Structures are given as structure tokens and as C-alpha cells.
Design an enzyme around this catalytic site. Structure first.
Site, PDB file in Angstrom:
ATOM      1  N   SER A 178      28.596 -36.232 -14.936  1.00 39.25           N
ATOM      2  CA  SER A 178      29.173 -37.571 -14.989  1.00 39.25           C
ATOM      3  C   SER A 178      29.175 -38.157 -16.394  1.00 39.25           C
ATOM      4  O   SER A 178      29.869 -37.663 -17.286  1.00 39.25           O
ATOM      5  CB  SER A 178      28.410 -38.502 -14.038  1.00 39.25           C
ATOM      6  N   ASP A 413      36.275 -36.504  -5.819  1.00 40.07           N
ATOM      7  CA  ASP A 413      35.117 -37.152  -6.420  1.00 40.07           C
ATOM      8  C   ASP A 413      35.376 -38.649  -6.540  1.00 40.07           C
ATOM      9  O   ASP A 413      36.336 -39.050  -7.214  1.00 40.07           O
ATOM     10  CB  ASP A 413      34.859 -36.525  -7.791  1.00 40.07           C
ATOM     11  CG  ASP A 413      33.600 -37.047  -8.459  1.00 40.07           C
ATOM     12  OD1 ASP A 413      33.257 -38.233  -8.267  1.00 40.07           O
ATOM     13  OD2 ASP A 413      32.957 -36.267  -9.195  1.00 40.07           O
ATOM     14  N   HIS A 440      30.444 -36.414  -5.698  1.00 42.71           N
ATOM     15  CA  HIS A 440      30.324 -36.536  -7.149  1.00 42.71           C
ATOM     16  C   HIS A 440      29.397 -35.432  -7.658  1.00 42.71           C
ATOM     17  O   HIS A 440      28.201 -35.427  -7.354  1.00 42.71           O
ATOM     18  CB  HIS A 440      29.804 -37.916  -7.539  1.00 42.71           C
ATOM     19  CG  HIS A 440      29.611 -38.088  -9.014  1.00 42.71           C
ATOM     20  ND1 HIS A 440      30.572 -37.733  -9.936  1.00 42.71           N
ATOM     21  CD2 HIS A 440      28.567 -38.571  -9.728  1.00 42.71           C
ATOM     22  CE1 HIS A 440      30.129 -37.990 -11.153  1.00 42.71           C
ATOM     23  NE2 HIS A 440      28.914 -38.498 -11.055  1.00 42.71           N
TER      24      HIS A 440
END
Ligand SMILES: CCCCCCCCCCCCCCCC(=O)O
Length: 470
Positions: A178, A413, A440
Site C-alpha cells: 500500500s 482492491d 487489499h
């Protein structure tokens, strides 16, 4: 720790023979003889022929890399465990690193979560922005303006090269999740000649407009909500009903009564064994938490079934997981660090019309997340009030000498949508590995198709073929 002195490793006080230590870095790289930060590190030594260290960042920002390394260790492929030291680090200002970003007391956070946070009238906007100004004042009071000014990713990338050298690696082998892919691309731009390998799972596009990225994230979570609800509709007792076209409606029939229908500032919390009860805002937060992974969908269903009976225990626990509030009511600093890092990593949005227009569009894009009707007003975000300027500017990644890298992107996601990974891979001239799912991140989380590609890349430098899917 002593600036320039090697890391003194000692057994952590834990799986493996984990070693822990600290690394000193300057707060301001333009003032090396000034204030110093101590970065906390964890190290799981390789079991076979060591290639080097695999350094990870779990994202956030504000998330502990030490905690993540402890979690990753349990799901690390045997081959990676053989050939690499698994190393986690807490970025400057995060978790066990010192100084640590602190703004809110535990009570400050609890008091905010008790509020519905749905009143976007002029009075409600004013109240939110007043709370936000008091938050910023607390950050400044507790942290230096100097420290706040230098917590950004541009400096994390410099810290990362110091970590590389302190681990004895000539070149960096890096896995970022991320937000950690912004660390990766920042490092790639400043230290391209030091990059051995990079896996970037759940991509941040550094050239994105902040508002459009936020709206794409709103759409991502609505898409995930829709996938959760269509799955639930096939299952007996679905608390959102058997017709997924009405799931958003039924959802709001469950959470909206948590707000006084005649005064949007008044909470009517669902009963919980916890003394807090479940506020509307915590209900939304707990729903968002569950949409990070299908492994939490059962919990969302439990939480919504409870709400049918005006109970809120499970959604409250999901919100506590999102906020990192432990069973004694103590928050870790991830929430405060997340804001302080985000606010210096790009220019904040300060235009009132853009913020208002953003809310108008978000209400239509992600209705599960919006209460009532568009008011014509909306609050500025926290960064609009930030007292130190940005240290990064949106731009397309330019690192022409960079080795081939692998960007992993999940088709649905919610937090870092799929296309953002396509764009990041294009900017890096790297490889795109696709994972079909509604979650995610995915690397080192139980999928052998993904993990086999990653292992071969980390060890042998082999990139997945164009179009590779898992
Ligand atoms: C992570 C917890 C701290 C949140 C940042 C402190 C600012 C608190 C005041 C804002 C109240 C929340 C309502 C607005 C949130 C939003 O804009 O989405």
C-alpha cells in the site's frame, strides 16, 4: 543509538531467533549534527545461504514494520526464509521509533468516535473544523514543528538507504504494501543504483490528483461492499436481504437509526457489552475495516445481524481493529502518525468548492458511506490546516536506470484500486502481476500462485510474464 555507529543486535523480548536493534538517523538530513531519531528494527536471520535482507513496509502510513515482520514471518515461503533475513522497521515517528508522533490522548479519540460525524450543515462543518484545529494544535504542542516537517516519505526513503547499509547489503531487496509502494518509488528515484529487487503490492500512484484518488478509493469500497453483499445474498439469513440491489438501502435501515433523526449531532448508539455502545461513525468504520478482506466478511455479517437486534458488539470490535484501540482502551500511534505523514507527502486540498464538490460526488459513488442528503457544505480535511509544508509533490515516477520491479495489483482492491497498480507499473517500466480478488494486498498471505512468482523474482530476478494472473 549513535549516529554512524553500527546496529547493536540483541534477542527481542518471539518466533525464530529474532534480533532487535535501533538505528540513529538525523531528523533533518540538511542538519546532520542536529536532532536525531532512533529507528526500531527487527531481524529474522536466514536459515540457508543468505543473499541479503528482505526489508518490508506494511503501509498505512503509521503502521509498524516490526509488527508486520512478525506477521509475515508466519506466512513466509520456506525458500525466502532460507535465502533472506526478514527485516522490519518502524518508520520515523511510528510505533517503537523515537520520537513517536503523538497528537490525541486515548480520551480525545474515544470522544470523537462517539460522535455520528454526519452533520454537514454550516454548524456541523464548523464543529468538525474546530475539532481539527485543536487536533493540529496538539500535534504541534507534543511534537516539534521541526520533527513534524521531516516525517515525510522523502526522508523515510533516505532512512531506508541508511537501513540498507546498516544491514550490510550493497543493494536493497524491498517489499512494500500500500503506502509502502510510495516509500519504494521514492527510494527508487533517489537511490536507483542501490535497488536489487522491489515488490510493490497495493499501489500508490504518486502522480494522482488527491481528490480523484480519494473518489476512486470511495468507488473501490463501494465495489467491495457490493461484492460482499452479493455474496451475503446467496447465504441464509443475510442481514442485508437476498436482493443485492437493495443491500445499500437495507444497510442504511440498520445504521441510520444510530443517529437521532431530528438532530444529526445526537448519537443513539447500539447496545454493546462495552460501555461505549456503537455510534454511526464506528459502524461505518467497522464496515470499512471488514471490506479489506473476505476473511472479515463473516464478521461484517455478524455485526449487521447484531444491528437488526440493536446490538453493536462486533462492528465496534471491527472499528477498534481499524483504530488500533486495544482491550484496555489504549490506542497505538498509527492514527496520529498516519495523518502527520500524509499531510507532508503532497500539497493538501484547501479549496472549499473542490471539497464540497468532492462530497457531492462521493455521496453518489459510495452511498453506503453517506448519511442523508448533500447539504451544499462539507469540511476541509486535516491537512488543509497543517502547519508545516509538503516535502513531496505529485509527479510520475522517473527512475530510468531502475532494475525490473514487480507491482502486484488486485482487481477489486478497495484501498489501492487495480488501475493504480497498472499506472505505477507503467511509470516504473516494471512488471504487473494481477490477482483476481476483493481485498487489499495479497503477497505472503496464503496464495501460492502469487507467492511463487514473488519467490522466483526475489531469488533469481525472474519477472512474471506480461499478463500474469493469479
Ligand atoms: C485518526 C483519528 C484522528 C482524525 C484526525 C483528527 C481530526 C478530528 C476532527 C475531524 C472529525 C472527523 C470528521 C471528518 C473526517 C473526514 O473528513 O472524513
Amino acid at each position: 543509538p549513535k549516529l554512524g555507529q553500527p546496529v547493536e543486535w540483541t534477542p527481542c523480548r518471539i518466533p525464530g531467533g529474532a534480533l532487535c536493534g535501533k538505528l540513529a538517523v538525523p531528523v533533518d538530513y540538511d542538519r546532520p549534527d542536529g536532532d536525531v531519531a532512533a529507528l526500531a528494527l527487527i531481524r529474522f536471520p536466514a536459515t540457508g545461504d543468505k543473499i541479503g535482507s528482505l526489508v518490508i513496509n506494511p503501509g498505512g502510513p503509521g503502521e509498524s514494520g516490526i509488527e508486520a515482520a512478525l506477521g509475515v514471518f508466519q506466512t513466509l515461503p520456506k525458500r525466502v526464509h532460507e535465502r533472506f533475513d526478514l527485516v522490519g522497521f518502524d518508520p520515523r515517528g511510528v510505533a517503537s521509533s523515537r520520537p513517536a508522533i503523538w497528537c490525541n490522548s486515548d480520551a480525545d479519540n474515544d470522544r470523537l468516535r462517539a460522535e455520528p460525524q454526519v452533520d454537514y450543515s454550516r454548524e456541523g462543518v464548523a464543529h468538525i473544523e474546530n475539532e481539527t484545529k485543536q487536533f493540529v494544535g496538539r500535534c504541534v504542542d507534543k511534537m516539534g514543528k521541526n520533527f513534524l516537517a521531516h516525517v515525510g516519505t522523502v526522508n523515510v526513503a533516505k532512512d531506508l538507504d541508511a537501513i540498507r547499509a546498516a544491514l550490510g547489503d550493497d543493494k536493497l531487496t524491498y517489499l512494500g504494501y500500500s503506502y509502502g509502494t510510495r516509500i519504494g518509488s521514492a527510494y527508487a528515484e533517489e537511490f536507483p543504483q542501490r535497488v536489487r529487487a522491489m515488490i510493490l503490492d497495493g499501489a500508490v500512484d504518486p502522480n494522482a490528483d488527491p481528490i480523484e484518488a480519494e473518489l476512486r478509493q470511495a468507488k473501490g469500497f463501494q465495489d467491495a461492499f457490493n461484492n460482499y453483499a452479493a455474496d451475503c445474498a446467496k447465504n441464509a439469513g443475510c442481514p442485508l436481504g437476498a436482493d443485492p440491489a437493495k443491500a445499500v438501502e437495507v444497510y442504511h435501515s440498520l445504521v441510520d437509526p444510530l443517529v437521532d433523526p431530528d438532530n444529526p449531532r445526537i448519537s443513539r448508539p447500539a447496545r454493546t457489552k462495552d460501555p461505549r455502545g456503537l455510534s454511526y461513525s464506528d459502524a461505518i468504520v467497522g464496515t470499512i475495516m471488514a471490506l479489506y478482506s473476505p476473511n472479515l466478511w463473516q464478521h461484517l455479517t455478524d455485526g449487521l445481524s447484531e444491528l437488526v437486534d440493536n446490538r453493536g458488539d462486533t462492528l465496534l470490535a471491527l472499528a477498534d481493529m481499524y483504530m488500533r484501540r486495544d482491550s484496555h482502551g489504549r490506542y497505538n500511534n498509527s492514527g496520529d502518525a498516519r495523518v502527520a505523514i500524509n499531510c507532508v507527502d503532497q500539497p493538501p486540498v484547501t479549496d472549499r468548492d473542490k471539497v464540497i464538490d468532492e462530497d457531492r460526488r462521493a455521496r453518489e459513488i459510495a452511498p453506503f458511506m453517506s448519511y442523508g442528503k448533500f447539504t451544499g457544505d462539507a469540511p476541509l480535511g486535516t491537512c488543509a490546516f497543517w502547519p508545516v509544508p509538503p516535502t513531496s509533490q505529485p509527479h510520475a515516477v522517473s527512475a530510468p536506470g531502475l532494475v525490473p520491479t514487480v507491482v502486484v495489483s488486485t482487481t477489486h482492491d478497495p484501498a489501492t484500486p487495480y488501475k493504480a497498480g497498472v499506472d505505477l507499473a507503467n511509470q516504473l517500466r516494471g512488471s504487473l502481476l494481477t490477482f483476481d480478488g476483493t481485498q487489499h494486498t495479497v503477497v505472503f498471505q496464503g496464495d501460492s500462485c502469487i507467492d511463487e512468482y514473488v519467490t522466483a523474482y526475489l531469488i533469481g530476478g525472474t519477472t512474471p510474464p506480461s499478463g500474469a494472473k493469479c
